[PDB]
Amino acid sequence: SGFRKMAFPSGKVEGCMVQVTCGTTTLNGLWLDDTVYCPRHVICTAEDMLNPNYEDLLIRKSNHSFLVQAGNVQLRVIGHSMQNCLLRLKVDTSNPKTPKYKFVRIQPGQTFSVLACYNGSPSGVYQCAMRPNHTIKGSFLNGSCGSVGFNIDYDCVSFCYMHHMELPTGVHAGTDLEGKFYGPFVDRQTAQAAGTDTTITLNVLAWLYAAVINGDRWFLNRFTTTLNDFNLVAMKYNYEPLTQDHVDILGPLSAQTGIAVLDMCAALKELLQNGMNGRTILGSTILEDEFTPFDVVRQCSGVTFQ
Amino acid sequence: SGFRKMAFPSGKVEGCMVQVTCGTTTLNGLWLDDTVYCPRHVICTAEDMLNPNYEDLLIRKSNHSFLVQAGNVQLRVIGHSMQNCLLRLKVDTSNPKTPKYKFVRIQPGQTFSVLACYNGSPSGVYQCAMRPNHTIKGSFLNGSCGSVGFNIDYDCVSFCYMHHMELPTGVHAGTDLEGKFYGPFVDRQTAQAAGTDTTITLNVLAWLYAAVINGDRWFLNRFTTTLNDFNLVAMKYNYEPLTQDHVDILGPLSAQTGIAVLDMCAALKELLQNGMNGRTILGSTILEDEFTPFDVVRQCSGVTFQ
Numbered sequence: 027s028g029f030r031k032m033a034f035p036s037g038k039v040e041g042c043m044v045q046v047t048c049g050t051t052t053l054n055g056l057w058l059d060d061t062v063y064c065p066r067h068v069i070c071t072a073e074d075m076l077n078p079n080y081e082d083l084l085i086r087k088s089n090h091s092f093l094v095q096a097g098n099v100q101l102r103v104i105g106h107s108m109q110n111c112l113l114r115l116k117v118d119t120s121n122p123k124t125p126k127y128k129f130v131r132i133q134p135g136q137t138f139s140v141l142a143c144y145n146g147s148p149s150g151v152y153q154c155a156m157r158p159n160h161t162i163k164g165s166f167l168n169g170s171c172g173s174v175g176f177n178i179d180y181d182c183v184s185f186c187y188m189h190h191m192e193l194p195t196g197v198h199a200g201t202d203l204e205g206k207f208y209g210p211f212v213d214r215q216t217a218q219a220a221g222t223d224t225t226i227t228l229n230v231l232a233w234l235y236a237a238v239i240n241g242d243r244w245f246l247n248r249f250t251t252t253l254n255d256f257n258l259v260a261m262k263y264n265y266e267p268l269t270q271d272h273v274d275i276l277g278p279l280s281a282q283t284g285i286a287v288l289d290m291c292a293a294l295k296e297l298l299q300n301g302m303n304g305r306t307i308l309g310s311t312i313l314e315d316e317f318t319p320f321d322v323v324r325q326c327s328g329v330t331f332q
Numbered sequence: 333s334g335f336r337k338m339a340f341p342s343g344k345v346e347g348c349m350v351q352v353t354c355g356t357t358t359l360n361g362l363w364l365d366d367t368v369y370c371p372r373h374v375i376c377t378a379e380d381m382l383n384p385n386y387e388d389l390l391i392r393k394s395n396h397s398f399l400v401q402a403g404n405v406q407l408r409v410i411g412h413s414m415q416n417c418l419l420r421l422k423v424d425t426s427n428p429k430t431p432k433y434k435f436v437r438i439q440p441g442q443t444f445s446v447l448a449c450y451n452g453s454p455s456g457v458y459q460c461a462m463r464p465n466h467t468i469k470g471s472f473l474n475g476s477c478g479s480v481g482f483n484i485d486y487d488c489v490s491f492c493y494m495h496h497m498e499l500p501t502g503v504h505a506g507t508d509l510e511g512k513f514y515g516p517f518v519d520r521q522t523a524q525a526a527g528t529d530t531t532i533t534l535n536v537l538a539w540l541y542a543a544v545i546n547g548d549r550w551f552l553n554r555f556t557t558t559l560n561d562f563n564l565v566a567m568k569y570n571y572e573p574l575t576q577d578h579v580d581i582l583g584p585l586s587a588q589t590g591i592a593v594l595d596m597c598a599a600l601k602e603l604l605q606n607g608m609n610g611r612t613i614l615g616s617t618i619l620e621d622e623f624t625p626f627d628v629v630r631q632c633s634g635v636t637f638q
């Protein structure tokens with residue numbers, strides 16, 4: 027029993043974190059086989075973070091412009107190239123701790139673990155959702171750039187995020203490991219703001235199923251709803267519209283609990299309209315939207331506490 | 333910016349997790365140097381979990397009664413002994429991945445990271461506080477026994493918890509790494525219940541400081557309180573009494589924000605009496621009590637957003 031925001035074990039990722047220095051700028055890099063990946067803003071001049079031309083900045087660099095440190099060991103850079111908003115540095119040594127890995131671009135509403143890092147040294151690990159507005163609600167300080175997000179399946183690490191910047195609202199923006207930003211953001215310190223965010227409906231429903239699996243039914247009701255009638259309410263409360271695909275994704279959780287998806291939607295409709303009446307769900311006074319259906323299945327028992 | 337429940341990176345601990353089997357019972361063990369530590373209830377007969385006499389059960393075992401698996405490698409047991417509620421198994425191989433480590437008994441209100449494990453395989457990592465009633469609000473399923481809790485300072489792992497049991501309320505009980513239970517619990521399936529819990533006042537105050545450091549002041553007020561007058565209110569709302577030692581611990585956070593501890597106590601008094609008026613603090617609609625002053629200092633900027 028219990029239900030916690032749970033990150034993946036971070037060991038396979040810790041073995042890949044290095045420090046990258048260009049001029050007086052230091053940030054984190056990710057070392058896989060003979061390549062080190064890092065945010066390309068490491069090459070920005072101290073004087074110009076507003077209008078960098080990265081092609082013009084990079085052509086002025088040699089391999090020995092870049093210093094790469096893995097623990098106390100210096101890695102010699104033997105090649106470099108830009109890929110979108112990252113740099114790919116070739117080094118003289120393949121990382122002996124390289125795990126089985128893939129690069130994946132995650133989708134809005136999906137979750138991942140973040141390994142917060144400073145000066146190539148891992149400091150903490152926590153779970154994040156990719157928000158509908160393509161930001162994450164992370165926890166990052168100066169020095170955290172190049173920290174990575176990932177998921178693990180069996181023994182394969184799926185890297186999905188590298189950290190680049192903080193927006194005015196205190197939320198975070200970054201790229202996949204091909205260097206393409208999540209959302210409309212750009213790596214320059216020109217004024218940018220996160221779009222309006224939305225509550226991840228699918229995740230709220232998954233979490234209500236988690237609550238039932240774990241033994242709590244207080245918030246259910248005798249009613250049902252149509253998908254379209256639910257969506258009228260969803261719009262009012264700034265929830266994402268529910269789709270048939272989302273209904274199908276919830277099949278396994280529905281089956282384990284014996285609660286039809288549209289019946290759980292009716293329960294959710296009532297919670298939105300009436301509130302929770304001073305009660306909690308899985309220890310929460312609010313409706314949680316950062317657990318996916320996959321996350322619920324991973325963490326909860328396969329046997330419902332009936 | 334941001335504020336998240338953040339666990340320590342788990343790699344140093346993952347390298348120590350093994351599987352221990354006696355008869356048909358399998359659980360997790362912790363492998364450090366040439367010793368494997370695990371819950372002694374691994375030796376319980378399938379028929380008797382109510383009244384085991386562990387001395388009588390253990391004397392009936394040989395070294396080869398115990399099977400220890402590290403990944404796909406079998407570790408030969410060459411000695412065994414009971415220490416309180418754990419078994420200490422001596423094995424033929426010292427763990428080459430043994431980190432610098434200490435065993436520490438943590439105190440109520442303090443936090444640690446839990447590495448949830450099944451069949452010797454780490455599955456997830458999350459942060460827990462030791463509750464005043466000596467339980468933790470974990471997330472554990474069948475097979476999780478022997479999962480460990482820890483903190484990390486510099487490169488030293490301070491192990492503080494090994495998991496043994498779940499109580500009727502869905503909360504968790506276990507031992508330190510000397511095998512002594514936290515709280516009045518015993519490792520037998522005789523009826524037991526967690527004592528009434530209390531809110532960790534020191535942590536709530538630390539978290540209010542975190543909110544100020546990160547830029548939010550909405551909940552402050554023009555008032556102060558005496559320690560004793562605060563405690564009258566604390567009793568009413570089931571908060572731990574605040575002591576001068578707790579006031580002294582909050583010195584550094586008070587200094588960084590320019591908010592005197594008793595002034596923050598007045599702010600907290602008002603929040604208890606009046607509620608939060610539909611507002612949130614660090615994204616929370618309630619008062620969070622699972623971040624210590626140390627946790628706040630670890631995670632927040634050393635510069636207040638004034």
Ligand SMILES: *[C@@H](CC(=O)OCC)[C@H](C[C@@H]1CCNC1=O)NC(=O)[C@H](Cc1ccccc1)NC(=O)[C@H](COC(C)(C)C)NC(=O)OCc1ccccc1
Nearest residue numbers: 067075166167168169171190191192213214215216217218
């Ligand atoms: C990682 C690098 C670093 O630490 O540099 C030293 C400050 C850092 C990660 C953030 C630090 C605190 N929390 C974080 O998540 N990233 C940066 O500082 C970004 C650096 C950069 C990006 C692109 C080109 C060149 C440099 N910059 C930002 O995150 C910046 C905010 O700066 C700080 C110092 C306040 C964090 N964000 C930004 O410029 O957003 C666009 C914007 C929005 C509104 C007004 C102006 C600009």
Ligand SMILES: *[C@@H](CC(=O)OCC)[C@H](C[C@@H]1CCNC1=O)NC(=O)[C@H](Cc1ccccc1)NC(=O)[C@H](COC(C)(C)C)NC(=O)OCc1ccccc1
Nearest residue numbers: 373381472473474475477496497498519520521522523524
């Ligand atoms: C770890 C071992 C395991 O998985 O065994 C197979 C079930 C497991 C961890 C819990 C599983 C689910 N969540 C957990 O945190 N621990 C146990 O199952 C404990 C085993 C044990 C303890 C002491 C002597 C011998 C065996 N037992 C319990 O946690 C038990 C609850 O059992 C389950 C199966 C429902 C989890 N708790 C208990 O007996 O508490 C005392 C009590 C309270 C009220 C009425 C009767 C007894």
